Design a protein around this ligand. Structure first.
Ligand code: MG
Ligand code: MG
Ligand code: MG
Ligand code: MG
Ligand code: MN
Ligand code: MN
Ligand code: MN
Ligand code: ZN
Ligand code: ZN
Lengths: 827, 827
RNA sequence: CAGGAUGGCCGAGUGGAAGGCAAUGGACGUCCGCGUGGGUUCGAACCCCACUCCUG
């Protein structure tokens, strides 16, 4: 049998001894020739349907030899084309002959989903009557036939006769609906039995027809078979069993079997029984009928296995990150931008960390990368863990090289020499290549070379020249498949890609939203948790600058919280102030005013609404912009905020799409918002919670949500320290983490309790939410973090004095976390 | 040669006598067998490429015979599929055998446009190297190859030598880049000429390569050709001529010839010159190389012609309305709705006119239409003129029947029996079928039977049963194709379809516009001429009723003109009133107000805007809708309208897409808006007229725009009467016509002068603009007609006492015409 | 899982149209033709593939 060589970074199938050369194969006997051909074609079909690979075969001669015309032709029928160079390339070295196979189709959603078939096959076993002949459907024909089937006469006069006369001329020829057969006196039953499988499916698949056995083909005379040599009852029984053995596949209800009418009719000669003639009328079958199981092969686990009929039909009719597939080009240009003229190392933080920890690693990698002048080298603590494989102790780092004039190379750097290091690297490279094809949807010729390196002081297969990354197009396509592969797993680069995906969704929704600047002056933007409200605000003020040509000091931003102002101020897109400062100072030169988290404002200090109206309505070029963003789900107090009554907040814009949180956190917010809807506070307007998110909107960005309870403060704090340590070891920056507590009066306690448990994890620097830019974990209260967001969030003991306010705290917390959220409730 | 028979409503090719039956064709000489096969395949390819048809061949025997396996296989190769039934159906009677051919590709923009080639071919004459062999590309392979070409070794060490030793075993086999050929023993130069086209194109098309002539294909020995047999220089000249004779096609510049290296090297035997060996190195060619002209055929006018190389490549690499194709389904359901269980006559106006003008026509049609229990019978004065053919005097009407269980039939009615009637009907039916396929994109099997009838006192081909319209699906598909066919011609049904296309475009724009209802209470809608402002107003009243659940009488519509008021009132979607009635009567019961044509309002009677604000913002269910539709290009007076300043008209919506006028009228409006902008009115703010129509927007609906200047008033009115008569004869109801004069005072003068001529055309009654729903022509002034539309508009002497309004009056006139506009300016 | 098919008839021919009952397939010395259609080869009745019918 055929099995995959286990020690390679690719699917390598060894088919054994094969006779190569046209003359040598001709000198063979037909049996040996066809058996070797079937072995090679099984290997080729399996590799085509399993992501490509290599076929290895030993050849009996030492000098170069051509493949052979029959092998050539079988490959041509396999790919349904004369372009062998596109899918098959051959090398030979001494006694070994290699065929390198490319994948037939790549990815879960190929561009050709409804155009080209899912599988290559040796045969589809689907037959249809093609005029006066029965023909087999190739892969394309069977694909179209199944696609059609899955969508939601004079012969009958003879058929009605009870008996036939010997020598009776039938008036019709063989045609699209009729077939004649005559068989020997000795082997009639066996011939009928071997006839059924080839004609009954052909009639069934194409519109039915009549099959007459006992009629001469040339003279159309009825002859039958002598009574002494046929038992009509046995013949009918065998015919029915024969028809019903046929594998039928359905796409409909009811799923009835193949329908037909069968008649064994006496043939009378001069008024006496000469013999019997068999007559079959086959109705049009509602679905596809196979004569036998399709001859298609696939590599699963480690064996070349044939696809069953149902599995074949399923593939032929029918995490995978759809947003990654959509944005692959933007994501690749953001993260894996291929440089001109120099080799890039990514991610830089992890690279610097590694070369600091391990002396001489810089020199090792630099001496190893001398050949490659242009490309990208992608580092990781362990690509095996990145790809959901097991971790191997002793691995310093793994690097993936994607450079010009070279194949992809996956390096494994070892602190000390090890024999199993090569096996680990080979497994990682095989997984990476199989994912780049099957999951990343790469359609070119790809191979990943596994090369182990050691810091302390079976040959690799040589692929054709076409497998080298010729230039920018190939490098960019491979990196765009790597993006899709990474977005299906959890890792540092996967999370960076998720962040950029969230940014792209925010950009799309802002492009939709920003068209309201020409259509409104007063606008009340009602956003939902994680709807990008603040990003939309900032981008709108940039747009106001661009459109009205007014300078930044002439645009005012007003918010409730000092951390949020401080964040907004550094952008330099405005003058940014707090509600109290706005009420106090003078802003008569301001033309445009933008107000954020208005639901958190208060009426005690003054009429901020009226002040904003007075300032804006005075603008020379007509009234200025006055946009008031707010979110009632994120209310933080039980008093009126000075906003106008609900009915008076017009015109409006609703930001209902969650674009700033990963899928787990988004679903968490959607679940929790029902809790607020079930019991809104008395001060909240009656009908302002009727806003609902877009029904089918999803982000397709992976994240982490975890709730741990019954734990003491020490246990919470050690768990936070451990998680931060793991993230930083993997390569996450500290500025991706923020610790949010219930109230400021607990912030000073938790800061000390956190330095206590984090001094054991080798980072002793924190800060409040007023110094976001610093590379350090932010510890602050949930409320003071309003309008801010961090990739990793640790929510500690949500708490408030009044249950009337308690419901909104959990949402106001979870909305701050982009990807990873850890909550520690009381228990 | 092959010629299309002229007396049929379809493409019929008579290929003469052909031997049919496998047993009969096996008795022929191969030469005759192949010639008959070539004739039939030429006919089939021409019909496939020309929209389908019938192949007529006389058969030499009386009894039914199968087509033959060689013919079947050639057809299978032709369509690249075993599904012959999809395209070819055969019927035979007596000594005649017919093959009915379906079109391969249909329509100007097929759905498979980039998936399948447009042409079927007998041979593409494109070859490529496949490892050791040269294969010809079929239609699909050549299509993909041309697409790829269009989108923007040790053998060298043998080629480097200047001589070879007889019997030398070359150290490499035949491969993708190497071919070995021996010299023929009889005609060496002719053999070389024969072989160069076989192998040079294959190398050139894919990667080039080496062709060794004089090398044993099996032993790889060098043999050459004896010096006494060939002249090396003559051989070189002939080879160069053969290579440069190869057809080539380019998708690039420079368009360079085939680049190759040719070496004639001495073959030495024991040191003495034995003969010559020929080596050609073929560099890869930038584009496609043919061995000869492609073997593709098409019907040109009435000759079955072959496509040239460049013409074939042009077809393979690549009025046709687009909106008709887009909306075919809805347009068909609107006009050509196929009813259940009865036969429908359309258009009913024309049907009634015909049966009133002609006695017994009702009996003729009804007695001819007895068999057809369901379908649609589409009437016209002359389908020939509808299809841009020449009219025939004596034709009463033409009816196109599309019924269940029947092929399409085109009926031609004559008053008196005529010999040319059958020819006229046949030509019309042939044109209609060719249009349904090549222009309407029908992909099924279609035939239009031509039948001639008369009031006063060549057999048709019997098509297969698959050409009958089996039910709703086929009837709908054919009628949807007829919609696209009609939309490309000027006719009554074409104009009706254009009207419905404009309605669908306006529905799309309203779907975009209507979501603003949830987001605004006060809104100013600034529409451009022909932007559908009034239609938006009506539909938004409907949506206000729907979404606020208030009774229709609670919604108020206020306009400036009594005709518009009435045209809105009769629809019961709201209460409609004038400004002069609004400012006086009691409207406290009103909740919501929609104001239209606000730019024409006046302040002399009161503060209409203040009253509207007061009524709306006091409403019992909170502040109600107050939307003010206005259009400054359509200003009718130079005074203040009472609208709030431009700076205060917010929130603001703009309707910039012209969706109410055909393409010529729209272009006229767009051009006149430039004059308006050049000289704006003084009573209008500076900024409003800076709203510009969508630059890239087009309607895709045909119409008439004609300016008839220097006419006198009597000539103007005679022309108007004549044009009205032509329209009414063609089938337009009079209520599609509006006659607009400069001002209301000249209404009576122009009306008297109108009747003075119109009473000669057998229509007497006219209608006022206050009775738009009448079945009579509307004569009124441009100002009084604002807000109303009709298909045909006659503009008489557009002028104003103060020329400052002259720019506005032309647009106020043109915007009223949906499809046909006739302007009669002053001398 | 295999095998046959040759000229009017019987039949010899497996890579440079016998014979037997003056010719004795055909198109225009070239080419087609040995069941039909293709392929390889300088060269096919002869080698390879598909198909037709029948036979083990
Ligand atoms: Mg014989
Ligand atoms: Mg023999
Ligand atoms: Mg033959
Ligand atoms: Mg020959
Ligand atoms: Mn048959
Ligand atoms: Mn048969
Ligand atoms: Mn060769
Ligand atoms: Zn079924
Ligand atoms: Zn070119």
């Amino acid at each position: 049998p055929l099995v995959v060589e286990p020690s390679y970074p690719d699917l390598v199938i060894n088919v054994g001894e094969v006779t190569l050369g046209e003359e040598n194969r001709k000198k063979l006997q037909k049996i040996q020739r066809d058996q070797e051909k079937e072995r090679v074609m099984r290997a080729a079909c399996a590799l085509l349907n399993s992501g490509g690979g290599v076929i290895r075969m030993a050849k009996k001669v030492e000098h170069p030899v051509e493949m052979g015309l029959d092998l050539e032709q079988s490959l041509r029928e396999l790919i349904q084309s004369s372009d062998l160079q596109a899918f098959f390339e051959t090398k030979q070295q001494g006694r070994c002959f290699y065929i390198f196979v490319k994948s037939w189709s790549s990815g879960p959603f190929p561009e050709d989903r409804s155009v080209k078939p899912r599988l290559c096959s040796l045969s589809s076993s689907l037959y249809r009557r093609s005029e006066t002949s029965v023909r087999s459907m190739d892969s394309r024909e069977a694909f179209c036939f199944l696609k059609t089937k899955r969508k939601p006469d004079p012969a009958d006069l003879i058929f009605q006769k009870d008996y036939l006369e010997y020598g009776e001329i039938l008036p019709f020829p063989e045609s699209q609906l009729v077939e004649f057969k005559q068989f020997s006196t000795k082997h009639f039953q066996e011939y009928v039995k071997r006839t059924i499988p080839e004609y009954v499916p052909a009639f069934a698949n194409t519109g039915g027809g009549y099959l007459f056995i006992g009629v001469d083909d040339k003279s159309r005379e009825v002859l039958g078979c002598a009574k002494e040599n046929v038992d009509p009852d046995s013949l009918r029984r065998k015919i029915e069993q024969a028809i019903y053995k046929l594998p039928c596949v359905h796409f409909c209800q009811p799923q009835r079997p193949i329908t037909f009418t069968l008649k064994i009719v006496n043939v009378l000669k001069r008024g006496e029984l000469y013999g019997y003639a068999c007559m079959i009328r086959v109705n049009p079958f509602c679905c596809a009928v196979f004569s036998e199981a399709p001859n298609s092969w696939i590599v699963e686990d480690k064996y070349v296995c044939s696809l069953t009929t149902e599995k074949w039909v399923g593939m032929m009719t029918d995490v995978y990150s759809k947003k990654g597939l959509e944005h692959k080009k933007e994501l690749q240009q953001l993260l894996f931008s291929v440089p001109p003229g120099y080799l890039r190392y990514t991610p830089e933080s992890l690279w610097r960390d590694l070369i600091s920890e391990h002396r001489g690693l810089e020199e090792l990698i630099n001496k190893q990368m001398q050949p490659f002048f242009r490309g990208i080298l992608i580092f990781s603590r362990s690509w095996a863990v990145d790809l959901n494989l097991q971790e191997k102790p002793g691995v310093i780092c793994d690097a993936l090289l994607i450079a010009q004039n070279s194949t992809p190379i996956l390096y494994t750097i070892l602190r000390e020499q090890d024999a199993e290091g090569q096996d680990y690297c080979t497994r990682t490279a095989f997984t990476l290549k199989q994912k780049l094809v099957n999951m990343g949807g790469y359609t070119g010729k790809v191979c990943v070379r596994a090369k182990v390196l050691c810091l302390s002081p079976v040959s690799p297969m040589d692929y054709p020249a076409s497998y080298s990354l010729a230039g920018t197009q190939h490098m960019e396509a491979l990196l765009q498949s790597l993006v899709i592969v990474l977005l299906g797993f959890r890792s540092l680069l996967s999370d960076q890609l998720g962040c950029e995906v969230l940014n792209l969704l925010t950009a799309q929704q802002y492009e939709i939203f920003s068209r309201s600047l020409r259509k409104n002056r007063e606008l009340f933007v009602h956003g939902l948790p994680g709807s990008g409200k603040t990003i939309m605000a900032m981008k709108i003020m940039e747009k106001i600058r661009n459109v009205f040509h007014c300078e930044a000091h002439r645009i005012l931003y007003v918010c409730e919280n000092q951390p949020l102002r401080n964040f907004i101020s550094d952008r330099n897109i405005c003058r940014a102030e707090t509600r109290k400062t706005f009420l106090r100072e003078n802003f008569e030169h301001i033309q445009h005013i933008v107000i954020d988290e208005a639901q958190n404002f208060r009426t005690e200090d003054g009429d901020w609404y009226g002040k904003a109206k007075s300032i804006t309505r005075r603008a020379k070029g007509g009234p200025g912009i006055l946009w008031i963003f707010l979110d009632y789900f994120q209310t933080s107090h039980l008093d009126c905020s000075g906003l106008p009554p609900l009915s008076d907040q017009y015109p409006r814009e609703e930001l209902t799409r969650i674009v700033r949180n990963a899928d787990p956190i988004a679903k968490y917010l959607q679940k929790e918002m029902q809790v607020i809807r079930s019991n809104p506070s008395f001060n909240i307007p009656t009908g302002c919670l009727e806003v609902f998110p877009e029904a089918e909107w999803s982000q397709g960005v992976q994240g982490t949500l975890r709730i741990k309870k019954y734990l003491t403060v020490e246990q919470i704090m050690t768990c936070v320290a451990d998680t931060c340590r793991r993230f930083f070891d993997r390569g996450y920056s500290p500025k991706d983490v923020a610790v949010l507590v219930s109230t400021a009066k607990e912030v000073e306690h938790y800061k000390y309790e956190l330095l206590k448990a984090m001094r054991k994890k080798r980072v002793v620097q924190l800060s409040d939410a007023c110094d976001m830019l610093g590379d350090h974990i932010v510890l602050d209260s949930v409320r003071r973090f309003s309008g801010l967001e961090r990739s990793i969030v640790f929510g500690i003991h949500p708490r408030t004095a009044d249950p009337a306010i308690l419901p909104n705290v959990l949402i106001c917390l979870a909305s701050r976390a982009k990807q990873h959220l850890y909550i520690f409730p009381w228990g």
